[PDB]
Amino acid sequence: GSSHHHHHHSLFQGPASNKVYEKTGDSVIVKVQHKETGGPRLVRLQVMGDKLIHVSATADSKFADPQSLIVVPQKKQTSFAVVQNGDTITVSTEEVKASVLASTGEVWFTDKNGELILQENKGGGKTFTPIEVEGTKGYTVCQVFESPEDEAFYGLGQHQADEFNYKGKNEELFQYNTKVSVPFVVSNKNYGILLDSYSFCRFGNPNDYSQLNRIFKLYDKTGQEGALTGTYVPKKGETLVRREDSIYFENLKTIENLPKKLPLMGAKVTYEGEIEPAQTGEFKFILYYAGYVKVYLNNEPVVPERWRTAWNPNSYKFAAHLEAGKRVPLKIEWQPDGGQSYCGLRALTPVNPEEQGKQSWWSEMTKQLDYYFMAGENMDDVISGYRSLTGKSPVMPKWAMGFWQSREKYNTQEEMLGALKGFRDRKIPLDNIVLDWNHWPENAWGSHEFDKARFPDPKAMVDSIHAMHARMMISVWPKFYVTTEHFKEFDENGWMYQQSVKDSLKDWVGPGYHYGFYDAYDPDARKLFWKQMYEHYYPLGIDAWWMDASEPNVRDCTDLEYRKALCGPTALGSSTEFFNAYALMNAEAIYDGQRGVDNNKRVFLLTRSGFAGLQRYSTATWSGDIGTRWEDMKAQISAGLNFAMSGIPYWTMDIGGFCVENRYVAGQKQWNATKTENADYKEWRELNTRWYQFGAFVPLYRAHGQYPFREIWEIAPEGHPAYQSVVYYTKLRYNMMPYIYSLAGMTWFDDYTIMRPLVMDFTADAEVNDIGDQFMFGPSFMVSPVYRYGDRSREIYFPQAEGWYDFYSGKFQAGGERKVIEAPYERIPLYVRAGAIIPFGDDIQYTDEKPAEHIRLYIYQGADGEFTLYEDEGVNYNYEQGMYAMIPMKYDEATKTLVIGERQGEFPGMLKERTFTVVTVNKEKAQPFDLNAKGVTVKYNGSEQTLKL
Ligand SMILES: *[C@@H]1O[C@@](F)(CO)[C@@H](O)[C@H](O)[C@H]1O
Numbered sequence: 008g009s010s011h012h013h014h015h016h017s018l019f020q021g022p023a024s025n026k027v028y029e030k031t032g033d034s035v036i037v038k039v040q041h042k043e044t045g046g047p048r049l050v051r052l053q054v055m056g057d058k059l060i061h062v063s064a065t066a067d068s069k070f071a072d073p074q075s076l077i078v079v080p081q082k083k084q085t086s087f088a089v090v091q092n093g094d095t096i097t098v099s100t101e102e103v104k105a106s107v108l109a110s111t112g113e114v115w116f117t118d119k120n121g122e123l124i125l126q127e128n129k130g131g132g133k134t135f136t137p138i139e140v141e142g143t144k145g146y147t148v149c150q151v152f153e154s155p156e157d158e159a160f161y162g163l164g165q166h167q168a169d170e171f172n173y174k175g176k177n178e179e180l181f182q183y184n185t186k187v188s189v190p191f192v193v194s195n196k197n198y199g200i201l202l203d204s205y206s207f208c209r210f211g212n213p214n215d216y217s218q219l220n221r222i223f224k225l226y227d228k229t230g231q232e233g234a235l236t237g238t239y240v241p242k243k244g245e246t247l248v249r250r251e252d253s254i255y256f257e258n259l260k261t262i263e264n265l266p267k268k269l270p271l272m273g274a275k276v277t278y279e280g281e282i283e284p285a286q287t288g289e290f291k292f293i294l295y296y297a298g299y300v301k302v303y304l305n306n307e308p309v310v311p312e313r314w315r316t317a318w319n320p321n322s323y324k325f326a327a328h329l330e331a332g333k334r335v336p337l338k339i340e341w342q343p344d345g346g347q348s349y350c351g352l353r354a355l356t357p358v359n360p361e362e363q364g365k366q367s368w369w370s371e372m373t374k375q376l377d378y379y380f381m382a383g384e385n386m387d388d389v390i391s392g393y394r395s396l397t398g399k400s401p402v403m404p405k406w407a408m409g410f411w412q413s414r415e416k417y418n419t420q421e422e423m424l425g426a427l428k429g430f431r432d433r434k435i436p437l438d439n440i441v442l443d444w445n446h447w448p449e450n451a452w453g454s455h456e457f458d459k460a461r462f463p464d465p466k467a468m469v470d471s472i473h474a475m476h477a478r479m480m481i482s483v484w485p486k487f488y489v490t491t492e493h494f495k496e497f498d499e500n501g502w503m504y505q506q507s508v509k510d511s512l513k514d515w516v517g518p519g520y521h522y523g524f525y526d527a528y529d530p531d532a533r534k535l536f537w538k539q540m541y542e543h544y545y546p547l548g549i550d551a552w553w554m555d556a557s558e559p560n561v562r563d564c565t566d567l568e569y570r571k572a573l574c575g576p577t578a579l580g581s582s583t584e585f586f587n588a589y590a591l592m593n594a595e596a597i598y599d600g601q602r603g604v605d606n607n608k609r610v611f612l613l614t615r616s617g618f619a620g621l622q623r624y625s626t627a628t629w630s631g632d633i634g635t636r637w638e639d640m641k642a643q644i645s646a647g648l649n650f651a652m653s654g655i656p657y658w659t660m661d662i663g664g665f666c667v668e669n670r671y672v673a674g675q676k677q678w679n680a681t682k683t684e685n686a687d688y689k690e691w692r693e694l695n696t697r698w699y700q701f702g703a704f705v706p707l708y709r710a711h712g713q714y715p716f717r718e719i720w721e722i723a724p725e726g727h728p729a730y731q732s733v734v735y736y737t738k739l740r741y742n743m744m745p746y747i748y749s750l751a752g753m754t755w756f757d758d759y760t761i762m763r764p765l766v767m768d769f770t771a772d773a774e775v776n777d778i779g780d781q782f783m784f785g786p787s788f789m790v791s792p793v794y795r796y797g798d799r800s801r802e803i804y805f806p807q808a809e810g811w812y813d814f815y816s817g818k819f820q821a822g823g824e825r826k827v828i829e830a831p832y833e834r835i836p837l838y839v840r841a842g843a844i845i846p847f848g849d850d851i852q853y854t855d856e857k858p859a860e861h862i863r864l865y866i867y868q869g870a871d872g873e874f875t876l877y878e879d880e881g882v883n884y885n886y887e888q889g890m891y892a893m894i895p896m897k898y899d900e901a902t903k904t905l906v907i908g909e910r911q912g913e914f915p916g917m918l919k920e921r922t923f924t925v926v927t928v929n930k931e932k933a934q935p936f937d938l939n940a941k942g943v944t945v946k947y948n949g950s951e952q953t954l955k956l
C-alpha cells in the first residue's frame with residue numbers, strides 16, 4: 008500500500024514518538040507524515056508572544072536548537088490553545104492563529120478572526136540540503152511563501168542598488184563596505200519575517216548570477232560568434248582591441264584577466280557586441296563597477312553614468328524583456344579611473360512571474376531552519392515585535408541628535424580643536440567632533456596610543472572639547488598590527504584570524520604593515536577588545552566610539568571564497584556558518600563593556616556594518632565609503648529607508664559622500680590658490696548643499712569624507728548660497744530639537760522608527776508603495792530631497808490625507824496628488840501633515856545649551872493629532888528607572904481644541920514651569936515657520952490646560 012499506509016503516527020500520556028504531534032510548555036512539534044526527499048521531518052511552532060511565533064524545521068529527527076545570536080529571552084509566558092482537527096494543527100494566541108499541516112509541514116498565519124496574513128508555498132516551501140564545512144555539519148535551506156500581487160516588502164538592511172519595494176526582486180545578503188545585510192523583511196500586509204541565519208543568504212532568486220557566456224550567445228563588434236569585443240584606449244600609447252569571453256573583472260583574481268600591458272588609469276574601455284538569449288522573458292542583470300561606467304542595451308541607456316572610486320566597487324541592477332533567438336546590441340563604456348579597477352556584467356535567466364513574485368529565502372548554512380513571524384496592527388507594531396524579539400533600542404544620548412562634524416582625517420590636535428572652535432566662533436551649532444584613523448604612531452595600529460608629535464596631550468584635547476560643550480568620538484578598528492602587544496595578546500589565546508598573517512598581507516600605510524583582525528565571536532576575545540579600549544581611551548574621557556571595517560573588511564575586493572578564509576574559523580563554527588554577524592558581536596563587546604564599567608553613562612557606537620539585533624547595543628550604522636555622486640545621494644534615501652524598516656532606528660551617512668572625484672579635488676586646490684570657482688567646484692558646492700539638506704532629516708546628522716575639507720566654511724564662504732543654506736538647516740536641526748529628541752525617546756518607549764518610508768504612515772494609499780525618494784522624519788514632516796545637479800524643482804507625490812502644508816510658507820497642498828514643486832538651490836521641499844503638533848525651541852549652540860523654557864507649539868490644523876513632548880537628563884540611563892517626563896498633547900479638529908496634558912514624571916534639572924506659544928496653521932491661514940509667530944501664550948506648570956482655537 009501507500010508509504011502513508013505502511014508508516015504513520017497517531018493514549019494521552021504515551022511516548023511522543025507514537026504521536027503525530029507533541030505539545031510542550033510553549034511549543035508544538037509536528038512530525039511530517041508524508042516525508043519528501045529534501046523536505047522537513049519535524050516542524051515546530053513555538054509561541055514567543057501574543058503576536059510572535061517562532062517556526063523551526065529540520066530534516067533530522069531532533070532539533071539542534073543552538074543559542075540564537077539575535078533573539079533575546081522574552082518578558083513573560085504567553086497563553087495559547089492548540090486544536091488538532093484532522094490534518095490541521097492550529098496554535099492560537101489572543102491575536103494570531105498559526106497552523107501547520109501534518110501531511111506536508113506547511114504553515115500559515117491568520118488573525119484572530121481567521122483572515123489570512125501569510126501562507127507558506129502551497130504543498131510546502133521548505134527544502135534542506137546537507138552542507139559540511141571544516142568538519143561541521145548543517146543545511147542549506149530554502150523557505151518560500153505565497154505572496155499576493157499587491158504585497159510590498161521593505162528591509163533586508165542597507166543596499167546600494169537604489170531598490171525600493173522588494174516585491175519580485177532579488178538581493179544577496181552578505182556584508183561589504185556600503186552594503187549592510189539584515190535578514191528581516193516587513194510587509195505592507197502588517198507582518199514581519201526574521202530569518203535566524205548568520206550565513207550568506209538570498210532574498211528572491213536562490214541562484215547566483217551567471218556570466219554572460221553561460222546564458223547568451225555572444226557576437227563581437229564584427230559579428231563573430233563566441234565573444235564580445237573589448238577596446239582599450241590608454242591615456243598614452245596604442246589602442247588594444249581583443250575578444251572577451253566574459254565581462255567579469257570583479258575581484259583581485261579576475262582583474263588579472265584584463266590586458267597585461269595596458270595601464271588603466273585614464274583609459275577608456277568599451278565592451279560591445281550583441282547578445283542572443285535562448286529563452287524569452289525578463290532577464291535580470293547586475294553590473295559591478297568602479298570608476299565611471301555607462302551601459303546601453305538594445306540602444307537604450309539602461310545604466311546612465313555611475314561612479315565609485317577605483318578601490319570601492321558597487322553593484323547596480325537592471326532588467327529587460329528579451330526574445331529567444333533575437334540578437335540585441337550591448338555596450339559598456341568604462342573609465343577605470345585607477346591602476347586597479349573593476350567592471351563586470353552578469354545575469355539571471357527569466358523566472359516565471361508566478362514564482363518570482365513569491366517571498367523566497369535562501370540560507371547557505373545553519374543547523375536547522377529558524378524564522379520568526381511577527382504580526383502587527385500596522386508597520387510600527389511589526390517593528391515593535393522585532394524590538395521585543397531582538398531587544399529595545401535605548402534612547403540615544405541627546406548630544407548624538409545634534410550635528411556631527413568629521414573628517415578623513417584631522418591630522419593633529421590643533422587641527423581638530425581649530426575646527427570645533429570654528430563652529431563656536433561662527434555661531435554654527437554643533438555637538439560632536441570626530442577623530443578618525445591614523446592618530447597612532449604609524450607602525451602601531453592597534454596600540455591605541457597617540458602619536459605625541461601630532462597629539463601632544465590627548466587628555467588636554469578631550470578636556471578642551473568638553474570645555475567647548477562638545478563630545479568626542481574616536482575611530483577604533485578590530486584590526487591590529489602583528490608587532491603590537493595587543494595583537495600578541497589575542498594571538499597567544501587563539502583569538503586572531505590567521506589567514507591575513509599566513510598570506511603576509513600588507514596594508515596601505517607607509518611601507519605597508521602586517522596585520523590581523525580578531526575573532527569577535529569569542530566571548531573572552533570581546534572582553535579583551537573592550538579592556539584594551541578601557542585601558543587606553545576611556546580614561547581620556549572619550550564619549551563615543553566609531554568602529555570601522557566591521558564587516559570584517561580584512562582585504563578589499565576579494566571573492567567570496569577568500570573572504571570566508573579571511574574571517575574564520577570562528578569560536579562558534581566556520582565563517583560559512585558565521586559570516587554576517589561580526590558587527591553585532593563587536594557592538595556587544597563595546598556596549599556591555601562600557602555599561603560594565605559605568606552602568607549609568609549612555610553608550611554611543613557607530614559601526615560600518617550591522618545585523619539583526621544591533622539596536623539593542625545603542626549602536627548605529629553608517630552607509631560607508633559611498634561616492635561624491637548624485638546617484639549615490641539618491642541611493643542613500645532608499646538605503647536608509649530599508650535600513651529603518653530592518654528595525655534599527657539610528658542610521659547615518661557621510662553627507663557629501665566619502666570618496667571624491669578627482670575633478671572635485673582639483674576644484675578645491677584651485678579655490679585655495681586663486682579663489683576662483685571652476686565648473687567642477689560649482690558642482691561640488693551644489694552637491695554638498697543638497698546633501699546637507701537631506702542629512703538634516705536623517706536620524707544622525709553628520710558630515711564626513713575624504714579631502715576636500717567638509718566644514719561648511721571650507722565648502723563656501725559666508726554669504727554664498729551654499730553656506731547660507733547649510734547654516735539654515737544646521738540651525739533648524741537645533742530649533743527642531745524638542746521634536747527630534749521626543750522621537751529619540753519614542754525609540755525606546757514606543758519601539759519607534761525615526762526615518763520612515765511613506766508606506767509606514769500611509770499603508771492604505773498604495774501609490775506610496777514604490778516611493779523611495781521621499782520620507783517622513785517622525786510623524787509630521789515629509790522630506791523630498793533634490794538629487795540632480797541644476798534642478799530647481801522636483802515631482803512630489805502627496806499621500807492621501809486631510810492635507811499638507813509647505814513648512815516654509817504655510818501654504819496648503821491637497822493630499823492624493825502628484826505635482827512639480829519648486830526647489831530653489833537653498834531649500835529642500837518640506838511639508839507638514841495636517842494634524843501635526845510640533846514643538847520648536849529657540850536657537851542654541853549645542854543640545855541643552857539652555858533650557859527649552861519657551862517652546863513654540865505649532866498646530867497644523869485640518870485633522871486630529873497627538874504628540875508627546877519627552878525630556879530627561881540626556882546623558883545617562885536614569886530614564887530606565889523612571890526619571891523622565893512626558894507632556895502629552897492632543898488636538899481635536901472637529902472642535903479646534905488643543906489639550907496640553909498633565910505632565911507625567913520628573914527628573915533632575917527638569918523645568919517645572921515653562922512657556923508655550925501655540926501657533927496655528929490652517930487652510931485659511933498660511934503661517935510661515937517663524938519663531939516670532941503670533942499665537943496664544945500658555946504659562947505651564949505641569950497641570951493640564953485646554954485651548955479652544
Ligand atoms: C574606514 O576608513 C577610514 F578610517 C579611512 O578611510 C574612514 O575615514 C572611513 O570613513 C571608514 O569607512
Ligand code: NI
Pocket residue numbers: 493539542543
Ligand atoms: Ni594595552
